[PDB]
Ligand binder design. Structure first.
Ligand SMILES: *[C@@H]1O[C@H](CO)[C@@H](O[C@@H]2O[C@H](CO)[C@@H](O[C@@H]3O[C@H](CO)[C@@H](O)[C@H](O)[C@@H]3O)[C@H](O)[C@H]2NC(C)=O)[C@H](O)[C@H]1NC(C)=O
Ligand SMILES: *[C@@H]1O[C@H](CO)[C@@H](O[C@@H]2O[C@H](CO)[C@@H](O[C@@H]3O[C@H](CO)[C@@H](O)[C@H](O)[C@@H]3O)[C@H](O)[C@H]2NC(C)=O)[C@H](O)[C@H]1NC(C)=O
Ligand SMILES: *[C@@H]1O[C@H](CO)[C@@H](O)[C@H](O)[C@H]1NC(C)=O
Ligand SMILES: *[C@@H]1O[C@H](CO)[C@@H](O)[C@H](O)[C@H]1NC(C)=O
Lengths: 50, 149, 298, 97, 242, 49, 50
């Protein structure tokens, strides 16, 4: 996040779930979220991510 | 036995290109005035102006056991002429267009495809045909059939 | 709004507009989506209104197996499976908001040993083989409806329906394509097609057959390059009353796709299973086998 | 042969010590044939053992090359078609009306 | 074509293009018009030639007096390598299989053809199947479902190949055009037209027009042709020449 | 005033077979509405005039 | 496609590849295509498609 000016916080990095731990304050109140965004993967040639 | 063969052509490449051209441009350009003014003794009004469509129709016919070019050479040396008749299907709208059905009947033309040509007069040869397309439709059923000889 | 489970076609072209149907599972089970495009200007909506379709029929939930649209008279015909596995064909009007149950598609498929066409009366016996629909079809020139699946049904009105004895219940329908001139092609999951003419009632088998084998060998010694011993029926369809099929070939040096004609007139003209009669002529016996056509020429 | 329907000259060439036979059509310049044929010359298959000549059908444009085999050509002679083959046999003469 | 037979003399048992357009006639009864010649030197075993023909006279079948095996049930199965075993279900000692029943063809309308060359028992024979790619099982038949044909050379060949009768009639109603040789002059501008009528006398090619016209010199003459059909396939044609 | 409907003799009611019916049966009614749907209409024609 | 007015044709249904067989005419000239559409999958609860 920015040095001091971030009004929110976002943290993910789970095992396989597209869930974040968005919370105000400094994670005094960890309110979990399930992210809308679907689950997409690019295709081929130019791209590869597998 | 004997069948026809149609591949669309890019009109700047009448002879040197025999491969498959795709239908891309839908704008007819005005590069005909300089050739239409070359006439002297023909019943053509100089007041009006004309303008060609893009793309050409290529026609040649194949029968097994021989080569397509020799078949086409035989065909023209006999008097083969491909009659083409195109019928147009109106688009699904009737508010901003009509349902009018129109057809054009044309005869093809003979074209000596440009190359080295070690022979003198008869050479690689393929029939060519104009390609019109009107405003207000997409569906064009083309019909190719023999002249009769 | 998502969770779309199926796309469904609208073949017709009316009101200067094209139509598609979106069926959705997971959520909004009692609801469907109608998508109308007016000359490239696209819109979609959720037609079954505030009430779920489960309000006006027994059961609890509703599953939309298949739906179809009729631009004339602003109609929707769709078949709903209910929680007890029963399939009910219900019609719906968009101009005025009704849905009405129009058929209660009976199960436990009946028998017809010789009743080649069977009006589906009530006093009909039933066999242990069940019924399983996978969709319907509308032929809107004569204003008629087809029901496919493990069986075929048809009608002109919407009161009764006709069952055809020839088509078995051991083969399930892949799909059905149309001439819009009177010719029905019905493809099965067995990769076999059945040809039916609207004037008659009998459904004529085509591709595993005497006529097809004769045609195939005839092409083989015709030595063409459109027929191969190994083939894959990638697709098939209709155009100006002629059946085309897109077929791929794994032939060595000829691993190629092409479209070819399937002339069914010749195909069932080469059907040698037929009556034969032996007469005596000039103190010799000749197979002067009988003529089944009612006439000579038209 | 000299054909007046198209004003051309037809040569039936056969190279010795080789089964190659072919037909060439040349244009007449001031009554004198020229090189550079109208179209590529027509080569016969190697099965043609011996050719013995050709004949135009009278008052027509049908060409007939005869010998160990029989080919018929319409048009100027660019294309010839089999009609009959004679193994170890050759036609001697032809009468036609 | 009999197997184990020299390559240089294969042509003596082969169809050629001379048979195109001729007709086949049977001594008993029958007349068919030849339409095509087919060559397949590999796919069928024992057969390399075929002719596609059209029946006008429906041909004569074998009697039961000379061949008493007709009054029984047939059962055809696959033999070991490439033959087919034919068994007569009736063990009646009146029917049997006579030694004169060689080079005969047994037909069932709807299935393959079988030629008998060997009789290994009094009710069991060996045969070759024409087009053996559509059997895939063991077949059974009855007394009056199959027939025999005798087209072999044994005892005298009984079929003939010969030319056919005239089948096309030319009708020209216009005066001074009936002459088989015609020379017509045209100046600049004026055109000349003629009409012909074509009348079939047998089965006629409805889709393909039956008169192909050829031009000796297309560079000086313009030829416009119309060809239409009648109810009884009478062909009206007219050509304009300028 | 005459009332007319279509009946099949093989699958008709008993009363229609003896001309004592006043109301068509189920099969007769369904076949009659099918004939109206496919478009069959009767009419009566006097013989003498 | 529509009854007669479709100027193109589209057909897929392969084993796993997001490819169609889009072609003009009536598949006289089968020109294959690879769609540039990302490969997406929806998430959960309301939805399932697995
Ligand atoms: C008769 O007309 C046909 C139709 O155009 C001509 O066939 C076309 O010939 C061209 C050759 O210039 C083919 O191009 C080829 O493309 C392949 C793959 O792109 C390439 O590997 C080849 O080297 C060649 O460039 C073209 O595909 C072909 N049309 C079709 C539909 O296959 C034909 O040439 C004409 N006859 C004569 C005598 O010119
Ligand atoms: C779709 O319909 C429009 C309307 O008719 C067509 O556009 C018009 O086409 C004509 C002739 O092709 C154009 O006339 C030309 O104008 C130029 C410039 O003034 C002049 O130099 C020429 O001598 C000729 O008179 C006209 O300008 C053009 N109008 C517009 C707004 O583009 C169009 O061709 C139709 N679409 C197709 C595919 O044909
Ligand atoms: C809700 O609908 C689904 C789909 O038809 C069905 O399987 C399920 O049983 C229904 N729910 C209940 C409680 O019956
Ligand atoms: C089978 O045919 C061959 C060849 O004609 C012959 O030599 C042999 O004797 C035959 N065998 C029988 C059992 O007929």
């Amino acid at each position: 996040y920015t040095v001091n000016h971030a009004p929110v916080f976002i943290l993910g990095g789970f095992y396989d779930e597209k869930s974040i731990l968005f919370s105000d304050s400094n994670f005094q109140d960890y309110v979990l979220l399930e992210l809308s965004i679907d689950s997409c993967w690019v295709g081929s040639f130019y791209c590869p991510i597998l | 036995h004997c069948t026809w063969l149609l591949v669309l052509n890019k009109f700047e490449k009448v002879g040197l290109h025999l491969s498959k051209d795709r239908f891309q441009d839908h704008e007819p350009i005005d590069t005909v005035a300089k050739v239409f003014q070359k006439l002297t003794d023909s019943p053509i009004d100089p007041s009006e102006n004309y303008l060609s469509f893009p793309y050409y129709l290529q026609i040649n016919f194949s029968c097994p056991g021989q080569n397509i070019e020799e078949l086409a050479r035989k065909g023209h040396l006999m008097g083969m002429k491909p009659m083409v008749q195109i019928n147009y299907m109106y688009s699904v709208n009737f508010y901003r267009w009509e349902m009018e059905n129109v057809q054009i009947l044309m005869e093809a033309a003979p074209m000596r495809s440009t190359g080295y040509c070690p022979a003198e007069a008869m050479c690689v040869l393929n029939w060519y045909t104009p390609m019109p397309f009107k405003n207000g439709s997409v569906v064009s059923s083309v019909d190719i059939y023999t002249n009769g000889i | 709004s998502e969770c779309i489970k199926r796309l469904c076609p609208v073949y017709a072209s009316g009101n200067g507009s094209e139509y598609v149907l979106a069926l959705t599972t997971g959520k909004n089970e009692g609801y469907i989506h109608i998508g109308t495009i007016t000359d490239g200007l696209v819109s979609f909506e959720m037609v079954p209104d505030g009430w779920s379709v489960c309000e006006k029929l027994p059961g609890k939930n509703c599953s939309i197996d298949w739906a179809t649209y009729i631009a004339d008279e602003r109609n929707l015909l769709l078949l709903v499976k209910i929680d007890s596995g029963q399939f009910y064909l219900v019609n719906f009007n968009t101009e005025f908001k009704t849905l009405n149950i129009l058929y209660k598609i009976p199960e436990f498929i009946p028998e017809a040993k010789e009743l080649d066409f069977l009006v589906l009366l009530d006093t009909v016996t039933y066999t242990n083989t069940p019924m399983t629909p996978k969709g319907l079809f509308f032929n809107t020139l004569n204003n008629m409806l087809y029901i496919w699946g493990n069986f075929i049904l048809q009608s002109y009105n919407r009161e009764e329906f006709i069952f055809l004895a020839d088509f078995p219940k051991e083969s399930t329908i892949k799909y059905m394509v149309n001439s819009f001139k009177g010719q029905m092609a019905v493809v099965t999951e067995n990769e076999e097609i059945w040809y039916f003419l609207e004037g008659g009632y009998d459904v004529y088998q085509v591709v595993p057959s005497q006529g097809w084998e004769t045609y195939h060998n005839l092409q083989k010694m015709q030595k063409s390059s459109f027929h191969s011993e190994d083939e894959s029926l990638v697709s098939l369809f209709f155009e100006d009353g002629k059946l085309f099929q897109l077929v791929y070939l794994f032939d060595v040096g000829k691993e190629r796709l092409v479209k070819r004609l399937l002339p069914v007139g010749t195909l069932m003209e080469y059907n040698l299973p037929k009556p034969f009669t032996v007469v005596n002529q000039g103190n010799y016996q000749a197979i002067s086998f009988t003529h089944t056509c009612p006439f000579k020429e038209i | 042969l000299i054909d007046q329907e198209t004003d051309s000259g037809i040569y039936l060439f056969n190279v010795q010590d080789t089964k190659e036979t072919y037909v060439t059509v040349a244009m007449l310049k001031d009554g004198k044939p020229s090189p550079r044929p109208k179209f590529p010359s027509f080569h016969f298959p190697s099965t043609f053992t011996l050719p013995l000549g050709m004949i135009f059908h009278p008052r027509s444009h049908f060409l007939y090359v005869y010998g160990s085999q029989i080919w018929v050509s319409m048009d100027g002679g660019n294309t010839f078609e089999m009609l009959c083959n004679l193994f170890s046999h050759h036609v001697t003469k032809t009468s036609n009306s | 074509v009999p197997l184990t037979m020299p390559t240089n003399i294969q042509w003596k048992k082969r169809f050629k293009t001379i048979h195109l357009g001729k007709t086949i006639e049977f001594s008993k009864t029958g007349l068919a018009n030849i339409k095509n010649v087919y060559m397949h030197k590999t796919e069928p075993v024992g057969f390399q030639t075929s002719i596609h023909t059209e029946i006008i006279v429906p041909f004569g079948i074998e009697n039961s007096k000379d061949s008493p095996c007709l009054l029984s049930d047939l059962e055809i199965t696959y033999s070991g390598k490439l033959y087919y075993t034919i068994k007569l279900l009736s063990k009646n000692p009146l029917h049997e299989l006579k030694s004169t029943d060689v080079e005969k063809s047994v037909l069932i309308p709807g299935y393959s053809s079988f030629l008998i060359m060997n009789i290994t028992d009094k009710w069991t024979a060996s045969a070759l199947a024409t087009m053996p790619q559509a059997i895939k099982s063991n077949l059974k038949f009855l007394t009056g479902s199959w027939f025999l044909y005798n087209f072999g050379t044994a005892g005298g060949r009984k079929w003939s190949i010969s030319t056919r009768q005239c089948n096309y009639w030319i009708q020209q109603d216009s005066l001074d055009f009936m002459s088989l040789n015609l020379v017509k002059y045209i100046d600049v501008g004026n055109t000349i037209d003629f009409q012909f009528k074509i009348i079939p006398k047998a089965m006629s090619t409805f889709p393909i027009p039956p008169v192909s016209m050829v031009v000796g010199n297309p560079g000086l003459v313009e030829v416009k042709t119309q060809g239409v059909f009648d109810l009884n396939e009478n062909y009206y044609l007219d050509i304009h020449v300028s | 005033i005459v009332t007319i409907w279509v009946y099949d003799p093989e699958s008709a009611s008993t009363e229609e077979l003896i001309w004592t019916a006043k109301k068509p049966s189920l099969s007769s009614r369904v076949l009659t509405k099918q004939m109206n749907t496919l478009g069959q209409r009767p009419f009566i024609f006097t013989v003498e005039k």
